[PDB]
Amino acid sequence: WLSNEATVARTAILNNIGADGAWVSGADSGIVVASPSTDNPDYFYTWTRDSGLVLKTLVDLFRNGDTSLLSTIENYISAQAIVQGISNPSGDLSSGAGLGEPKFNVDETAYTGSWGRPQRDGPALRATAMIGFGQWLLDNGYTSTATDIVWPLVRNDLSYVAQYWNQTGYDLWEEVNGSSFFTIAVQHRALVEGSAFATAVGSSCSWCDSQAPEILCYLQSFWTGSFILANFDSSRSGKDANTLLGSIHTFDPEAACDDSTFQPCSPRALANHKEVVDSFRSIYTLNDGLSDSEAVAVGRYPEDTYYNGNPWFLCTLAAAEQLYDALYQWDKQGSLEVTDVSLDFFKALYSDAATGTYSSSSSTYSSIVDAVKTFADGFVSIVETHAASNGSMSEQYDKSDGEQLSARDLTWSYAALLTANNRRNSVVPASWGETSASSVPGTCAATSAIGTYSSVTV
């Protein structure tokens, strides 16, 4: 099913991208629409986050050999030159504040209604998407495109992150004003790979270099001692697919099981995995009768009331993806570790789990990775059960009966499927430099640095 579903996923995404995507007539060239739904709910807009996550996926597929995605990527780049310059209710380009705008109309005009703005993850995610393509351009002799177009676009977004990271905004769910794990994690990543891109184009990013370790320093605060807190400050539990998404979208296939960057196989992210997934076990009738060793439908956070509070396709896929990422890392390392922090995670899947280090050649490793693989597959199977017979995936599936609800054909659901399927196949993205960006400063500073903002014309 995964193979055929991935086929539908690629084409479905393109159907949601302007100008010629079949489901989104009216959308400009290179504009990713979140869903073709214009009513109940109205998702016929372009979000900087959704577009950036979708484009990262496309760039990764393109770089792995899917070369026909070229014009789609190029079109996105062109669109973003325009989008960055749209004065909007978050602000303008000159001050940088405009880059924090969550969403835009599909014809590249400001969305003027009230909204949970700014959302500071956007510029980080766009930079991350663009950098990947900048890397490819350099590798294939397109130096002028990488240096004159991609870099200046990236430079605006890196400047935004360095200047504004230490300010409150809304989370990825657009609901909680504060400071959010997912946002901080992806911002840290963006500054690190952004600095390396700057060097590669014969430039520099001094604001990237000074701010990255401070963002990482702050990121440590999200560890509660048993899971990763989603937001400061909230009276929710803080258990949130937010933190699964933070881990998988900052996964570096070169990384060890680093707690400081909450890598998928780190004891912190594994402990968090169990806490987040477990929060959905009792609250959905869809999960009735399943035991703690079995996968379940996963929503956003247990307190969610959006459409009554339901499982989400992308959140269930994130639970699978972190595990596939852990499997890849454990295999690359040639070992797996059970710690006091991660013991409960392991014990639920393998009853005889005990603290220690088990070699890939070893017997214990085999039993654990087998259980982990089956568990991860369990999440994908639930997704497969609730996708339409033609492969369509909405935003949500029903907490009681698994019927699809909210926005139909959610682009981000398709991207999540493609990434989850890839990691299951041991297909991993380019490294982002985590191996020399996991050192936490002794003392954290509430600070910023100033870059440069300049309008790009393509």
Ligand X SMILES: *[C@H]1O[C@H](CO)[C@@H](O)[C@H](O)[C@@H]1O
Ligand Y SMILES: *[C@@H]1O[C@H](CO)[C@@H](O[C@@H]2O[C@H](CO)[C@@H](O[C@@H]3O[C@H](CO[C@H]4O[C@H](CO)[C@@H](O)[C@H](O[C@H]5O[C@H](CO)[C@@H](O)[C@H](O)[C@@H]5O)[C@@H]4O)[C@@H](O)[C@H](O[C@H]4O[C@H](CO)[C@@H](O)[C@H](O)[C@@H]4O[C@H]4O[C@H](CO)[C@@H](O)[C@H](O)[C@@H]4O[C@H]4O[C@H](CO)[C@@H](O)[C@H](O)[C@@H]4O)[C@@H]3O)[C@H](O)[C@H]2NC(C)=O)[C@H](O)[C@H]1NC(C)=O
Ligand Z SMILES: *[C@@H]1O[C@H](CO)[C@@H](O[C@@H]2O[C@H](CO)[C@@H](O[C@@H]3O[C@H](CO)[C@@H](O)[C@H](O[C@H]4O[C@H](CO)[C@@H](O)[C@H](O)[C@@H]4O)[C@@H]3O)[C@H](O)[C@H]2NC(C)=O)[C@H](O)[C@H]1NC(C)=O
Interface contacts to ligand X, rule CB under 6 A: 81-82, 84-85, 93, 152, 163, 213, 258, 435-439, 441-442, 445, 447-448, 450, 454-457
Bridge partner residues of 336 (DSSP) = 358
Question: What, of ligand X, ligand Y, ligand Z, none, does residue 168 touch, CB below 5 to 8 Å by kind?
Answer: ligand Z
**Residue 12 interface partner, choices ligand X, ligand Z, ligand Y, none, CB cut-off 5-8 Å depending on type:** ligand Y
Closest to ligand Y by CB, 9 vs 97, is: 9
Amino acid identity of residue 352, one-letter, is: D
* Cα distance between residue 189 and residue 32, in whole Å: 23
Question: Is the Cβ–Cβ distance between 128 and 70 less than 8 Å?
Answer: no
Query: What does 167 bind: ligand Z, ligand Y, ligand X, none (CB cut-off 5 to 8 Å by kind)?
Result: ligand Z
Please, what is the minimum distance in Å from the beta carbon of residue 51 to ligand Y?
A: 17
Other Cβ atoms within 10 Å of 142 Cβ, number: 15
Q: Rounded to the nearest whole angstrom, what is the least distance from the CB of residue 444 to ligand Z in the complex? A: 4
**Nearest-approach distance from CB 16 to ligand Y, in angstroms:** 10
Backbone angles phi, psi at 58, to 5 degrees: -60, -40
**Would you list the DSSP string of 246-266?**
HHHHT--TT--S-GGGT-TTS
What does DSSP say about strands 231-232 and 335-338: parallel, antiparallel, or unpaired?
unpaired
Distance from C-alpha of 220 to C-alpha of 81, rounded to nearest angstrom: 34
3-state secondary structure of 126: helix
| DSSP notation for 280-302 | TTTT-GGGTT--TTS----BS-T
Closer to ligand X by CB, 385 or 435: give it. 435
Nearest-angstrom CA–CA distance, 365 and 274: 19
Q: What's the closest the beta carbon of residue 363 comes to ligand Z, in angstroms?
A: 37
Q: Is 262 helix (H, G, I), strand (E, B) or coil?
A: coil
Please give the full DSSP string across 14-38, using - where no structure is assigned: HHTBTTT-TT-TTPPTT-B-S-S-B
Q: Which does 84 bind (CB under 5 to 8 A by kind): ligand X, ligand Y, ligand Z, none?
A: ligand X
Tell me how far, at minimum, the Cβ of 170 lies from ligand Z, in Å. 12
Q: Can you say how many angstroms the Cα of residue 40 is from the centroid of all Cα atoms in its chain?
A: 26
Choose among 123, 251, 136: nearest CA to 187: 123
DSSP, res 440 = P
Query: Binding residues for ligand Z, per CB under 6 A?
Result: 166-168, 179, 217-218, 221, 224-225, 232, 444, 446
Q: Which residue is nearest to ligand X (CB)?
A: 85
For residues 236 and 276, is the Cβ–Cβ distance under 8 A?
no
Nearer to ligand X by C-beta: 293 or 447? 447
Q: How far is the CB of 243 from ligand Z (least distance, A)?
A: 13
**Is position 171 annotated as part of the catalytic site?**
yes
* The one-letter amino acid at 286: L
373 burial level (CB within 10 Å; 0-12, 13-18, 19+):
middle
Among ligand Z, ligand Y, ligand X, none, residue 226 binds (CB under 5-8 Å by kind): none
The one of ligand X, ligand Z, ligand Y, none whose footprint includes residue 218, by CB under 5 to 8 A per kind, is ligand Z
| Residue of 50, 60, 157, 171 marked active site | 171
Whether residue 90 contacts residue 98, with contact meaning beta carbons closer than 8 Å, is answered with yes
Pick the closer one to ligand X by CB: 98 or 402. 98
Q: Is the distance from CB of 138 to CB of 200 less than 8 angstroms?
A: yes
Q: Which of 20, 74, 92, 174 is catalytic?
A: 174
- Torsion 431-150-78-145 (CA) sign: negative
Nearer to ligand Y, 296 or 405 (CB): 405
Q: Distance between CA 452 and CA 205 in Å, rounded?
A: 10
292 is catalytic: no
**Partner whose binding site includes residue 224, from ligand Z, ligand Y, ligand X, none (CB under 5 to 8 Å by kind):** ligand Z
Which residue in this structure is represented by tokens 């280090």?
Answer: 357
Strands (E), 99-208: 103-105, 109-110, 169-170, 177-180
The residue among 8 and 418 lying less far from ligand Y, judged by its C-beta, is 8
Residue 115 is assigned to a ligand binding site: yes
Binding site for ligand Y (CB under 6 A): 8, 12, 23-26, 36-38, 40, 44, 388, 390-392, 394, 404-409
Q: Which is nearer to ligand Z, 168 or 374 (CB)?
A: 168
Q: How far is the CB of 339 from ligand X (least distance, A)?
A: 17
- Active site members: 171, 174
Binding residues for substrate: 115
Binding residues: 115
